[PDB]
Amino acid sequence: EVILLEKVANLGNLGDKVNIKGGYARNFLLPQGKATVATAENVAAFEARRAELEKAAAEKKAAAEARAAQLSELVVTL
RNA sequence: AUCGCUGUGAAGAUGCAGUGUAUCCGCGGCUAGACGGAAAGACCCCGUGAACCUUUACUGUAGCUUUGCACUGGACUUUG
């Protein structure tokens, strides 16, 4: 009932329509820009933007290549 | 035009019967009667009357409480 927009969910995919609970669509996914309710009004707009899904979702895992190298330094003085 | 007694009588009589007493009218007192006056008896009964209190009367309800379904999600584990 929703199109996903992130591939790091524990039971999610790239852009697959999944039918989920109403609270999970309502309260978490839609206010955080990671899913949108699968409506039958703009479906021909999704197929003319399928090459937009590759760039940011490849760059996200590519930015964590050098992001995790500064978290495990253990230089925080309590 | 309002006596006493004895009877009689819705059964305790100024008014009925019989019979005694008694000229007409105040004033001051006293309360024995007028089943005196005051209150459509309070007790008792009755009303398929009422009111309010009680409870283990009947029937319900406020409140308190149990679970289901919503609001209400993901993730693991035990499990049919």
Enter the tokens of residue A7: 């591939």
Q: Resolution of the coordinates in A?
A: 2.8
In this complex, the residue with its CA at the shortest distance from the C1' of nucleotide B72 is A23
Enter the tokens of residue A62: 């590519």
Residue with tokens 């495990």: A72
d(CA A22, CA A25): 5
Q: How close are the terminal C-alpha atoms of chain A, in Å?
A: 47
Torsion of CA A61, A20, A26, A56, to 10 degrees: 20
Domain count, chain A: 1
Enter the tokens of residue A36: 């949108």
Contact, A1 CB vs strand B, < 7 Å:
no
Q: Which residues pair with A18 in a beta bridge?
A: A2
Contact, A23 CB vs strand B, < 7 Å:
yes
Enter the tokens of residue A22: 């109403």
Range of the domain at A22: 1-78
Solved using: cryo-EM
Q: Which residues pair with A4 in a beta bridge?
A: A35
Q: Which nucleotides of B are covered by protein (CB under 7 A)?
A: 71-76
Contact, A21 CB vs strand B, < 7 Å:
yes
